[PDB]
A paper describes a structure:
The capsid of EV70 is composed of the subunits VP1, VP2, VP3, and VP4.
The structures of altered and empty particles of EV70 were determined to resolutions of 3.7 and 4.3 Å, respectively. The empty particle of EV70 is structurally similar to the altered particle but has the interpentamer binding interface decreased to 1,650 Å2 and the rectangular pores on 2-fold axes of the empty particle expanded to 25 by 16 Å. This pore expansion is caused mostly by the loss of the structure of a helix formed by residues 90 to 98 of VP2. Nevertheless, the residues forming the helix, even though flexible, are still located in the vicinity of the pore. The best-resolved part of the capsid of the empty particle is the intrapentamer interface formed by VP1 subunits, showing that the contacts within a pentamer are more stable than those between pentamers. Although the pore located on a 2-fold axis of the empty particle may enable the exit of a single-stranded RNA, as was proposed previously for EV-D68 (56), we cannot rule out that genome release is enabled by particle opening, as was proposed previously for echoviruses 18 and 30 (43). Because of the low number of images of empty EV70 particles in our data set, we were unable to identify the presence of open particles in the sample.
Numbering used by the authors:
A (entry chain C), D (entry chain C): 2 to 72, 79 to 169, 189 to 233
B (entry chain B), F (entry chain B): 34 to 42, 62 to 87, 102 to 241
C (entry chain A), E (entry chain A): 59 to 83, 93 to 133, 143 to 275, 283 to 290
G (entry chain C): 147 to 169, 189 to 194
The structure:
């Protein structure tokens, strides 16, 4: 060989796919171990739920930001995953911040922390891209919706296809027995679905 | 979930923690709670009567370095070692690790919601990158339990002490 | 899909050390390979509890004079071995020990370190102290199997009359990564290069 | 060919696996000879016994450091192969000093230099990792042990799996005839077993 | 397993010679290839009584001025042949004799010497004097078949007005090593580059 | 052991060395002891009666350059040439080569322990890197014998002189 | 009691626990 240099050289390119020359000529590495919790794709991570700050309002602090008290709207969630809002501190909103733009569906899961004897109907409704905010329950009743009765189903789940909002209102008032207080609480949670994809890396602004 | 049967290569029942509407949350470190290549499993339930309200997030975190506010100083012996007596979360929202409670569901998690179930159970297979730890001085898993929503219901004499009972077995442990 | 495979999420060559020293009318480096000297890669790495990888390392010099094509020596020093006292030391000669000599005007030097620990993977967090028994001076979580050696560097021709600063920049491309046990994202500023403590403080997202 | 240089070049890397250009175009080398004592692996060397300084105490000099006089403990051997101690001057402790960490089993062989008519029982006992030193023969009798009678077996051998100590006590007093003195002596020896492995080179501190 | 194969134990490129000379307002090298000029490689090599190997040699210059890209000549001189008197000598021209010219700013020069002796291997120790009969001046153990020639070097362009020191560093990678008859480790400091004498002195290990 | 039958490509019996409780040890160089491509074998035994105590390490070292304390000066003729008369170890613990006696077992070694056996034998095949040395001026092997544990037992008139008898054959020697 | 041979009787699921005694000190609760 001419023994000087190879073509496509005399640079350093920050993200290259070429190999390099090893220290320790045949040091055999310490073995593999078959432990669980393998991960192979970030999407396996982003598909796992997180709670979200449905109570991001300025009076709330610590854990209280993650729960809404039910004694008209209860919460109304700005639905962009990477702009500031409730989703900003979730696996969805953390992982995806590393990337240019995103595609595929989400789902929420709500959960109601009540006493077993307590019930009520909440309308949930969803505002597709370009929509206005449902001002009150009559626009939610005409909008794409689910009526969550806390009976049968302590923890409703609602897919979000591919944005405005998910919005949730006291359609009935609450009902509870004499032995359980009105300090009743909803938890809100979200993930991406199996169909999700993230396009092209751009380093996150949070740190 | 992590999908192992408890495996290598008799339960112990801790004294019940007196939860309250204000409580921040509790943790235990394994093996420290037993006083060892093992498949720990953890089985926790509430002594909660049907009027009661509120909910707990049960999580097992691997290699959970408890952090602290307001100093660069690392934790002492007595802050990290707690045996079966366990430790409090000084800041549950940061999970003490400066990480959101809201994202702790990436770790194997189960819910005690007092409508649906007062009981939850988790298998914690061996995660250590050495094959059988043998010294008293490390804790591969931390079991953590946090009041996501505050305890409620009852009146007067019932005094809101609604206990949590924790149980642990080092299932398939070898030495 | 692109940077959704974890090797592509992590495999961006990080500037893990950025430093300088002069030669004028001491002045050698000894930095241990732990990716805690730079905050972006700290967070991006901390999303996984255990990782197994080879490390490519690239060394790039740069000069402000007050070009001289000097010889730079890079040396890798293993976990817990002896390290030199000055620009001159018998350690820089070491027979059983990897090193590279390169000229400043050549394209920058590259090395591979194979996966280097007595444990099967790097445990990116560890909450213990020792492998046998603990003394008072054994700090919480600084595991010896995570020590990963150090890269040691000096100017070899430093007799020069001309007066200048060498800058060095060190880029690590962790490569061929296998990863285990994902983590909740680190959502808080970093006080130090050893533990995780902090002083946003009480509300992670805006109103 | 373009005839300038080849890719992966313009450096010298101290431990490289690449070939080089010969002086003497086809000088045929002086032949091979089939002589014994071939060696192919360092492990073939480290598997061969050495005596060890079981009598390292400050009064002992020259050969006396390798023998213990038997007229309560006789000797108690710190069992780390590469830290300072009796093993430090053995093939085990010399070869392994060139490497980062070690794995696999050892074995001791003791030997008793007595007169043929002389006998006694010595308990030997072994302290696994993290154990305390057996203070006297009652803890040795409860510890993992062998009782070496000098009858039948002038030279007991004891494997060490994979540390504290090997410890050896006058369980009986000695017995000897009128024609042989109490200047009776034990020799201690050690090697690694077939299972041994040494991971990664780091040059020895003894020279 | 890694550096347990003897070729990997020994095959680390040793800095076997480290020297300088000036040119200003004599000064050539003639060093014989014997690995006794540096103490670490002395010991690491002395663990075997006979070795057969090719030698790679790499030459690295370096400069302190008071860069000039000079031509350096390396020459190999065989066992017992004529050697030059000064920077200028007919020997530097030798027709039947290997040499390499290289420029200081090129990456450093490499050569292979094939295994070079009239004996089938290098006898790393030898206790005799001569192959026929002995005179008084024939020193104990300095065997002629072990002479292995010398590497000879000069600056070719040395007319320069500018004032400086050339440092040279010479790295030998003994390569493709076959070895015979292992030895008890040399546990004592080295007084000289010919025999093995000494002056730790009487107790090899600490108390 | 080295696994050759004595091979190329009548014994000689040296006068018995008078060992004592204090003795440092003795060596002989081959071929020098015979006064030649060969398989030397060496057969050494103690004239020790059953009361006696102590033990010898018997070793054959290839190319054993005897060193010395306290000078850079190389050995003279008379220091290295000793015929059958042999030489003393001035420092057995350094094996004179600045190498530990304790590690000399890497060389082909045998034990005379007076309980188990008063006799030991070694085969020393040709190691020279030239095929048949022919001059009087080199010694490929050194037979060495060292009191690892001091001679003992007996009383008074027995005077502790308990002899060593050495025997050598150049088996399969050709010229 | 937690280190002794034991059963934890939750009054949930099982209003009336039963425990065999093989063949003495106590049963303690």
């Amino acid at each position: 060989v001419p023994t000087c240099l190879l073509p496509g050289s005399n640079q350093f390119l920050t993200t290259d796919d070429h190999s390099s020359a090893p220290a320790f000529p045949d040091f055999s590495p310490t073995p593999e171990m078959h432990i669980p919790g393998q991960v192979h794709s970030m999407l396996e991570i982003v598909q796992i739920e997180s709670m979200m700050e449905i109570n991001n309002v300025n009076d709330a602090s610590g854990v209280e930001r993650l729960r809404v008290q039910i004694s008209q709207l209860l919460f109304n969630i700005p639905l962009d995953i990477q702009l500031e809002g409730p989703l900003r501190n979730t696996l969805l909103g953390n992982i995806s911040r590393y990337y240019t733009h995103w595609s595929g569906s989400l789902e929420m899961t709500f959960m109601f922390c009540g006493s077993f004897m307590t019930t009520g109907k909440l309308i949930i409704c969803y505002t597709p891209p370009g929509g206005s905010s449902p001002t009150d329950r009559m626009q939610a009743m005409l909008a794409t919706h689910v009526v969550w009765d806390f009976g049968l189903q302590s923890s409703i789940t609602i897919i979000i296809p591919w944005v405005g909002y998910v919005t949730c209102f006291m359609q009935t008032n609450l009902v509870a027995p004499v032995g359980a207080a009105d300090q009743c609480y909803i938890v809100g949670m979200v993930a991406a679905k199996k169909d999700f994809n993230l396009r092209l890396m751009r380093d996150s602004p949070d740190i | 979930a992590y999908g192992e049967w408890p495996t290598y290569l008799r339960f112990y029942t801790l004294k019940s923690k007196k939860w309250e509407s204000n409580s921040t949350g509790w943790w235990w470190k394994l093996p420290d709670a037993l006083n060892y290549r093992s498949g720990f499993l953890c089985h926790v339930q509430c002594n909660a009567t049907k009027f009661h309200q509120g909910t707990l997030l049960i999580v097992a975190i691997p290699e959970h370095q408890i952090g602290k506010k307001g100093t660069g100083t690392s934790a002492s012996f007595a802050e990290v070692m707690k045996g079966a007596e366990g430790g409090v979360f000084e800041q549950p929202y940061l999970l003490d690790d400066g990480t959101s409670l809201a994202c702790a569901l990436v770790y194997p998690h189960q819910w005690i919601n007092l409508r649906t179930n007062n009981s939850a159970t988790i298998v914690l297979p061996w995660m250590n990158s050495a094959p059988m730890d043998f010294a008293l001085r490390h804790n591969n898993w931390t079991l953590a339990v946090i009041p996501v929503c505050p305890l409620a219901g009852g009146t007067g004499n019932t005094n809101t002490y609604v206990p949590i009972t924790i149980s642990i077995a080092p299932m398939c442990a070898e030495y | 899909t692109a940077e959704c495979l974890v090797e592509n999420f992590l495999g961006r060559s990080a500037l893990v050390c950025m430093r300088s020293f002069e030669y004028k009318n001491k002045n050698f480096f000894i930095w241990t390979l732990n990716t805690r000297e730079l905050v972006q890669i700290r967070r991006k790495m901390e999303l996984f509890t255990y990782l197994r990888f080879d490390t490519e390392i690239t060394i790039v010099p740069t000069l402000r004079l007050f070009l001289p094509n000097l010889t730079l020596q890079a040396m890798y020093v293993p976990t817990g071995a002896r390290k030199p006292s000055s620009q001159d030391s018998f350690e820089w000669q070491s027979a059983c020990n990897p090193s590279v000599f390169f000229k400043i005007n050549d394209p920058p030097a590259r090395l591979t370190i194979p996966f280097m620990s007595i444990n099967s993977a790097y445990a990116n967090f560890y909450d213990g102290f020792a492998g046998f028994e603990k003394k008072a001076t054994v700090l919480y979580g600084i595991n010896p199997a995570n020590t990963m050696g150090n890269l040691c560097l000096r100017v070899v021709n430093s007799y020069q009359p001309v007066q200048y600063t060498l800058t060095v920049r060190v880029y690590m491309k962790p490569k061929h990564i296998k990863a285990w046990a994902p983590r909740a994202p680190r959502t808080m500023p970093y006080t130090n290069i050893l533990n995780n403590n902090y002083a946003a403080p009480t509300a992670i997202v805006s109103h």
